[PDB]
Every structure is written in structure tokens, then in C-alpha cells.
Design a binder for this molecule. Structure first.
Ligand SMILES: [Au+]
Ligand SMILES: [Au+]
Ligand SMILES: [Au+]
Ligand SMILES: [Au+]
Ligand SMILES: [Au+]
Ligand SMILES: [Au+]
Ligand SMILES: [Au+]
Ligand SMILES: [Au+]
Ligand SMILES: [Au+]
Ligand SMILES: [Au+]
Ligand SMILES: [Au+]
Ligand SMILES: [Au+]
Lengths: 172, 172, 172, 172, 172, 172
């Protein structure tokens, strides 16, 4: 029986705890992605850094959700964090494809929780997601889509490689 | 068949991966401890901060182990991260008692892995633990022991409270 | 047969060497006091620091006496330094009571050596003690007396605790 | 009959002198590698610089061993420095493969001397190697392994070239 | 029954307390050496300063051992500090010879305690000695050996004096 | 068949490679000289530094010759570096006498290679030696000659010692 809780449904409280788990799982996935690219037999430092930075972003997302949970008088509950879906992550392309799948899953969970807060007439929750998460996900998915296009361009062809280099070295 | 691996036994490689899991589990435990103390019905911000800072230290420990794993040509393998042993953590005293138990478990795992690296004649591993982990654990356990003593002093008695305050307010 | 010695009696020379021993013994006592309060099961850092600072002051006193011994053409002679009277020092109150006893012993030895230098018509020695030691001891004994009063106030009672806090937190 | 020598076996003294020779030989090898890449018909300035910097590192390693030899009261003895194994060093790939072989040889000699100092109960020697040499070798071998992977990627294929460029030009 | 003590044998605890006594005794010896050289009939200020600086180093060594004792949950125990072996210390040469004997005794006690911590599988203790004491002793013994050589050179002969002066006044 | 080589005889190319060997051998000799003077039973730090600085100068000379070899389109070839002529180097005087012998040998090799480049009508080589090596050797041999004179003065006599000191301490 919380002294602060107001207009905060048990349904949202539970879904927030699930979303925390999903974000921490995503962080874990990215930690694994990051260290795979740091292997001596893989050795793509920029790819390693890109994923390790995402591990930190997803951890921060979970912590913001947990802070919000307490701000509303809900109770943080933590579950098993499942290990990432793969032990080795293939090429940059394979990894960036797995990343964009992961981000779309998070984005859909965000959208689901928003629809829940809408249905529960919880405008604080709706604003919280909109202001801290929904655009962050859109921007990130756009960037990953950009990357997948450039990765494919570069691995694909003479014409692709040349277009990339002209953009990178002349239009710089 | 790694191009860099030299004097790095499969036994150590595996134990390093287990130790990563233990550190990440400890980080998770501390995240849970931290957010428990941020609850409105608990509200000890300094205790929250103490534990959240430890969550970050234990995460950093795991990342240093993972970096080292790749430096030696071993292969990082990640497992399920089990949820913390409790959902609610009681008083500051209960929490600090659970923390020192956790730290002793980590310290013993460190000591076990050191004895393994000794037995495997792996001086790089031995030096790595000594230089980055063994003293950090001793210092932290000493600080927690200090804390448990002061917590007990303060909750215990008139005489205890007064000794604490004289130290804190006059000998300042 | 010293080329510099003038108006410096063998009685004073010997008493200076004894006083050096007493100061070094006091330093030793305070080193022991300091480290007792740094124990994890004692853990009063401010008390530890107060005593370790006194260990250094008493060492400096001995060195000033030794410098003076050579300035007058006397010969420094060192004896066994007896271990402190206790291995464990009890409460802050017990320790501060033992400290003020120790300081009074030093102060009386100073006063005795002054009376000796008076009787020997040795105004340099008399001035040396007055200017470097006698007021230092008075100031320190006053501070310790202040402390004993506040320690007793704080451990003693509700009324005592409250008077202390008002002084410390409002009249600040 | 040295006035300083303590706990320093003739076996270690001799092995230190051998290790000095090995380091100076490695320096010589790298000098040769460096100047090969500065030839007008080779002309890879970055490769030249990479090897000349290693020549200087290996020289510094020998000088640190020689300083330590005198610190322990051993006697530096110098032998013929054999010329490098090749007069011409092939491609960047051939050269980086020869470099990592050389580094593994040094690393194994370090490990052998550590095992010797262990067997001789010479903790100063063990600490010296650990603190100045063992991690330096691990880090360097990891970097060379990284390089071999990227060299092979780049010389190998369209897909390899593109992965490298995306890492280098976009994830920059 | 200490709340922090882990992997810290009674044998090491006791030997640490003995080593503290040895360091404090060495400090005492150096205090005596220092003041002997400040006598008007000796008057070698640089020699006085060299020894008084060593008195302070050996005191600091004891305090570091005592801090470590508490960090591990051991209990500092202090004994009688025996007076130095001599009341007068002869020439610079005699004094520097007594100093290097003293340092070798400390170094051997360090090595003995290291072998003990090895036998007790106490890697924290081993690392502590290696990182704070073993190299400090080697460096100091090397410097004293250097000094003994130069002292003997200078007191010995015309040729010795001239070699010293050329080094000091021209190669400066 | 070099694309840059012009007016660069095989005779000069070979002699340059020999001169590189001689310079590196001289560097090696000086490394040995330097560390001999750092022995605790020798302990002339200024003499050690003088020789170690020369080791670095002779290494730099070899590298400048190697750079020049490639600039002209010749091919660097390295041979065995023979160990120095002595393992122990005697007094400062003995060492400075061996140094000036070594320098005269280098100077004569320089002069021989200059006469060769003259005979081959190779003005670039002639200018290179003149501008980077011939005066450096003259200046160094003059300084060593100065030193030998002062060493002999100082070890020799009362009158010699006094002349040196007046120059050093008054005319300063
Ligand atoms: Au809403
Ligand atoms: Au909405
Ligand atoms: Au080891
Ligand atoms: Au070890
Ligand atoms: Au007087
Ligand atoms: Au008086
Ligand atoms: Au060892
Ligand atoms: Au070792
Ligand atoms: Au150990
Ligand atoms: Au050890
Ligand atoms: Au010419
Ligand atoms: Au010419």
C-alpha cells in the first residue's frame, strides 16, 4: 500500500518490470556482440565499440525505467537474464542485421506499453516513453538501416565500393 | 586454433568465463540492492548510491576479465544471469551483511582462479588478478567491515550513538 | 671534552636523554592507539587520525630534544623503547582517558627538567622548554579535557546528546 | 663476491644475460624489417615506422634487463648479435607473420625465466618480469594478431575489403 | 573472530607483527645514526640527512605493514623496541657498512615472509611485498653498494680521489 | 635494377653496409662500457652516462647511413654484430683510452669511404659524410683528448689535482 502511488495500474507496473528485463537482455546481447568483434580473429575495433556503446545505452534505458518505477510507487522485480541468442556473431552484416531485429523488438515492446498506458489513461507513462524512448529507438533504427545499406553496398560490388568511397573521400 | 594463444590453459579460459558470470551476477545483485533503497518507503539515498556504485564496479570487473580473455586468445562465453537472491533487502544492516557475503564469495573465486593459474604456471593470469582484483576486494571488504561495525554501533545503544557522533562531529 | 659545550650540566644532559625516551615511548603508545581504532571491529577513523597525529607530534618533540642535545654539545644516548601499556584500548573514552594520563606524565617530566635547569642556572634550557614544549602541553591537555567532557556528555544522556547537537548543528 | 648480491642465483644471472641477447637480436631483426619497408621498391612508410618503433622497444627491454642485472649484483656479459634470419622480408603479411613468431619466442623465453625464478624462490625477478614484460608481450601479440587478421581480410576478397572500409570509414 | 578475515593465516599475521618490529627497530637505528653525524665533533650534515631520511622510510614501511595487517583482519601487536647496536657509529664508511648489513637483514626478512605467504597460498600478501617492499630494498641496497664503493675510492688513494673528482666535476 | 639509383657505385653501396656494421659495433661497445660503470663495485654514474650517450649517438649514425643507403637506391645488408673486445673495462682512464681508439677507427673508416666516393666521383656521398659525420668525429675526438688529459692530471699528482680544482672551482 504505497503512500505515493496514484493512477499507476498493476498492469503497467508489471509490464515496466518486463521491459526492464528486455532492456537488460539487450544490453547483455550487445556486450556479447562487442566482445566478439574484439577477438583477434575478428578484430573490427569500430564494430566492437559500436556494440559496446549500445550495451551501455540499453543498460541506461533499464535504469531509467527502474527509476520511473520507483517514482510512481511501483516495485522493481528482477528476473533471470537469459544469455544472448548466439555465442559467435558472424560478419559485420550478420551482426548489424541481428541488432536491427533486436531494436525492432524493443521498439514494439515500447509501443505495446504505450498502448497499455493509453488504455489505462496513464498520461505520465505515455509522456515518459515518448520523451525518453520512442524517438531514441526511431533514430537508432534509422542509423542501423543506413548502416545495413552501406555494409551491403561495400561488400557487394565495384560500383558499390566506388559510390561509398566518393561519398566518404570527396564529399567529406 | 588461435594465432595469439600462448601458455593459456583451457581450464583457466573456462574459469575466467565462470568468473565473468559471477561478477555480472554481483552487478545485478547490487542493481537490485540500489533500487530497493530508492523506494519511497525505504528512502535511504546514500545507501542506494553506495550499492549502485558497486553495481558499476562489478560490471567493470567483468569487462576487464572479458578484455583479458580476448588478450590471451580465449573465447568469451556467456551464460544465463541468475536473478538476485532476494527481491527486498531489509535494513541497511541486512543489506551490508548480504554485500559482505557476496564480496567474500567473489574474493574466494578470485583466490581459487589464482591457485589455478599458479598450478598451470600462468604468471600473466596471476599478475592480472593481483594487480586488478585482489587488493580491490581486500580494500572493499575492509570498508564493509568498518560499515557493519558503525551500523551496529548506531542502531545498538546510547553509548554507541554517542561514540559515533563524537567521531563524526568533533574529530571531523 | 666538547669544543662547544658551555653551561650544560651532565645532569641536564642525562635528563634530556631520558625525556627523549619518554617522548618516543609516547609516540609508540599513540601509534598503537591509532591502529587500534583502524581495526574493522572498532572503525572510528577520526579517533585513529587524532592518535596517529599525536604519534607524529611526540616523535617531533623527541627530535627537537635530540637536536638541542647536539646544539649544546651533549651526547644523545638511546635506550630500549618499552611497548605500550595496553594491546587493546577500549572505548574512545578509555583511550582519551589514557591519553590525558600520558600527557600529564610528559608535562610533569617537562616541569621537572625545567626545575632542574633552573637549579643549574641554565637559562637556554629553560627558554627552550618554555618556548617549544610547555604551552604545547597545556594547549593539548586543555583540548583533551574538552574532549573527555564531550565524550561523557554524548555517551551519558538524552539531555547531554541534545546539548552537544545544538552546539554542533545550530551554533555552528 | 658482490657486496649487494642477495638471493640471486647464478642460473638467473646467466639466463638474464641470454635474454638480453635475445632482445637485442629482436631489436636488430626489427631494424632490418624497418629499413626493408623504407626501400623505394617497397615503400610502405607506416610498416617501416611500425617496425622501427618495435626495434626501439626491444632495445629498451634489453637495457631494462641490464639495469636489473646490475641492481641485483649480477654481471652483464654480452655475446655476438646474430644477423636477422632474412635480408628481404616479403609482403606486409610475411613480415607481420615473422614478427609474431619473434614475439612468441621472446614471450616463451620470458615465461621460461619466470619459471626459473619461481623455482629459485626469487620473487623480485618474478615481479620484475610480470610488471615490465609479461603484459607488454601479451598486449603486443594481441595487436599483431589483430593486424594479421586485417591484413588477410584486405588482401583476400571484395567482402573483406568492404568490411574493413566500413569499420574504418563509417564506424570511425 | 574477524568479520573480514579471509585466507589470512595466523602464521602470516604473527610474522607481519615481527616484521613491523624489525622495521621500527631499523628506523630507531637510523635515528641514532642521523644524530651521531649531527654531533659538532662529527659534523657531516649530508650523512646525517641520508640517515634521518632512512629513519622516516623505515617508519613508513612499518605503518604500511600495520595498515595491511588491519586490512586483512589481523591484529597489530607491538613489542619492546630494542635500542640500536651502537651508541657511536665511527666513520661514514663504518656507518654505511652497518646500514647495508641492516638493509640485507630487512630484505631477508621480507624474502622469508614472501616464502611463507607463498607456502600459505596467500597471493595478496605476496603481491603486497613485491609491490611495496622488495624492489625498494633492491634499489636501496644497490645505492648503498654504490656509496661504499665511492667512499672506499675517496678515502683510499690519489688515483681514487682523482677518478671520483673527474666523474663529479667534469662528467657532471 | 633500381628505379632511383643514379651515380651510386656498388663499391660505395658495400662500404656503406660495412660502415653501418662498424657503427652498430661501436654502439654495442659503448652499451657494454656504460653498464660496466653502473656496476655497484665500479659506480661512476657520470662515466656510465657518458658512454651510454655515445652508444645512442653511434646507433643514430648507423640509422642515418641506412636511411642514406635507401635514399640512393642501395640495399641495406646486415651482418653478425661482434661482441665488444672486453667484458670489463678497467679504470675511467682505461675506458676513455679504449673509446678514443674506437673513435679513431670510425674516423679512419669515414675518411676511407670519403676517398672512395671521391674516386667514384660521388659528390652526394662526399657531402653526406662531411656534413653529418666528419666534424662530429673531430669534435668528439677533441673532447676525448681533453678528457684523457684531465683524467691523467687528476690521477697523477698533487700539482695536477690542484690545477684541475682551481680551473673547476675558481675559474668556473
Ligand atoms: Au495517455
Ligand atoms: Au499517448
Ligand atoms: Au604464477
Ligand atoms: Au602468483
Ligand atoms: Au633558567
Ligand atoms: Au625559568
Ligand atoms: Au617468485
Ligand atoms: Au611468480
Ligand atoms: Au602467492
Ligand atoms: Au609470489
Ligand atoms: Au666528391
Ligand atoms: Au670531397
Amino acid at each position: 500500500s504505497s503512500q505515493i502511488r496514484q493512477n499507476y495500474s498493476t498492469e503497467v507496473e508489471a509490464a515496466v518490470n518486463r521491459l526492464v528485463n528486455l532492456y537488460l537482455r539487450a544490453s547483455y546481447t550487445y556486450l556479447s556482440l562487442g566482445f566478439y568483434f574484439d577477438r583477434d580473429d575478428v578484430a573490427l575495433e569500430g564494430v566492437c565499440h559500436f556494440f559496446r556503446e549500445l550495451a551501455e545505452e540499453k543498460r541506461e534505458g533499464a535504469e531509467r525505467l527502474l527509476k520511473m518505477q520507483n517514482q510512481r510507487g511501483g516495485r522493481a522485480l528482477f528476473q533471470d537474464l537469459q544469455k544472448p541468442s548466439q555465442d559467435e556473431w558472424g560478419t559485420t552484416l550478420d551482426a548489424m542485421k541481428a541488432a536491427i531485429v533486436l531494436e525492432k523488438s524493443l521498439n514494439q515492446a515500447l509501443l505495446d506499453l504505450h498502448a497499455l498506458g493509453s488504455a489505462q489513461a496513464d498520461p505520465h507513462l505515455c509522456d515518459f516513453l515518448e520523451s525518453h524512448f520512442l524517438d531514441e529507438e526511431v533514430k537508432l533504427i534509422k542509423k542501423m538501416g543506413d548502416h545495413l545499406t552501406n555494409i551491403q553496398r561495400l561488400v557487394g560490388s565495384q560500383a558499390g565500393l566506388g559510390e561509398y568511397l566518393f561519398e566518404h573521400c570527396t564529399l567529406k
